[PDB]
Design a protein around this ligand. Structure first.
Ligand SMILES: Cc1nc2c(O)cccc2c(=O)[nH]1
Length: 350
């Protein structure tokens, strides 16, 4: 049997659940009959990105309709879709293409989870859970519910739950202190930067075996820069509300996972509108999309020398902005060091 604590066991069982991986793929409209979980390859996803990149170029620049048609057929043949009784939409709408780039981001993490799952499991001297936990190469520990560390994080969750996102409540079911192998080391050079904050990052539970083993990462070279609001970086938020929405939970599936990472922001390049950033301006270390609401700067605390914006959602003086909430993007995989993983319970208003 498992040596791990119960909460951790329930976590491993949850992130490695095969049923959830298929549910995700069905929601992305993949044909599971023609494309089973085990057919997924990194090479395959790379090519699909390249295809989406070209089609995006043809739409923007007015390429022949025959070109867009050919590209759509190649994409749908590479990744078989199931549209039921409806005709398959062509990749001719820039919003649909963006939807498809997001699908590939998720498939990258799902592919990692399955590969790990079917990996070295022959050992009989270990419990399956213990074996899969070790594959994550991440030390996971339960944060004590009554300690200061936990108190602060609960305060951060409660106080930063935005007004327009109050279509559900949020209960912190469990808090885990995570430490990925060799991550503290690759982040060492960034402790030299100022403006290091404890930000949020939400994602589907199906992405967590990938996030924990490979860490958070920027999209591959093949992905179109356009597929992302502020270019190809790593996104965070200061309002639990905003990140929580990327968990993709529902009334029928209410438990979501959410990360708290320390991010070395330094001098931020403030933007009020989207921008397909390739180069970062000299002297800038990250991008910050300004929102109409942000935690109250008065209430900002520190946790191990890291700023924690646990203030209540106050309206900022900026009005000419397109964003409702702030977004933080770093463009180097080493500018972040993951700290906590929270198990959240979304109570939907009925
Ligand atoms: C996947 C993800 N994306 C985000 C974003 O684009 C902006 C702000 C936050 C997030 C987040 O938490 N997760």
């Amino acid at each position: 049997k498992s040596k791990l604590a119960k909460p951790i066991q329930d976590l491993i069982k949850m992130i490695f659940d095969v049923e959830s991986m298929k549910k995700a793929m069905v929601e992305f409209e993949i044909d599971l009959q023609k494309m089973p979980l085990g057919k997924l390859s990194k090479r395959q996803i790379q090519s699909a990105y390249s295809i989406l990149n070209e089609v995006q170029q043809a739409v923007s620049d007015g390429g022949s309709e025959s070109q867009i048609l050919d590209l759509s057929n190649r994409f749908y043949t590479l990744i078989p879709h199931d549209f039921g009784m409806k005709k398959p939409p062509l990749l001719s709408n820039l919003e649909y293409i963006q939807a498809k780039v997001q699908m590939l981001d998720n498939l990258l993490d799902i592919e990692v989870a399955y590969s790990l799952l079917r990996g070295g499991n022959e050992d009989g001297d270990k419990d399956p859970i213990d074996i899969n936990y070790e594959k994550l190469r991440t030390d996971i520990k339960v944060v004590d519910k009554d300690s200061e560390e936990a108190k602060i994080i609960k305060q951060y969750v409660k106080n930063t739950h935005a007004a327009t996102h109050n279509a559900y409540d949020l209960k912190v079911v469990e808090i885990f202190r995570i430490e990925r192998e060799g991550e503290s080391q690759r982040y060492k050079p960034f402790k030299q930067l100022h403006n290091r904050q404890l930000l949020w990052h939400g994602s589907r539970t199906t992405n967590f075996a990938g996030i924990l083993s490979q860490g958070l990462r920027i999209a591959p070279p093949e992905a179109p820069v356009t597929g992302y609001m502020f270019g190809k970086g790593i996104y965070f938020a200061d309002m639990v509300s905003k990140s929580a929405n990327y968990c993709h939970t529902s009334q029928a599936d209410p438990i979501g996972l959410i990360l708290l990472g320390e991010v070395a922001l330094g001098n931020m390049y403030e933007l009020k509108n989207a921008s397909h950033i390739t180069k970062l301006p000299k002297g800038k270390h990250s991008v910050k999309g300004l929102g109409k609401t942000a935690p109250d700067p008065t209430a900002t605390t520190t946790l191990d020398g890291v700023e924690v914006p646990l203030g209540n959602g106050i309206s900022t003086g900026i009005n000419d902005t397109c964003l409702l909430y702030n977004e933080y993007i770093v463009y180097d995989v080493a500018q972040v060091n993951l700290k906590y993983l929270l198990k959240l319970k979304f109570n939907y208003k009925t």
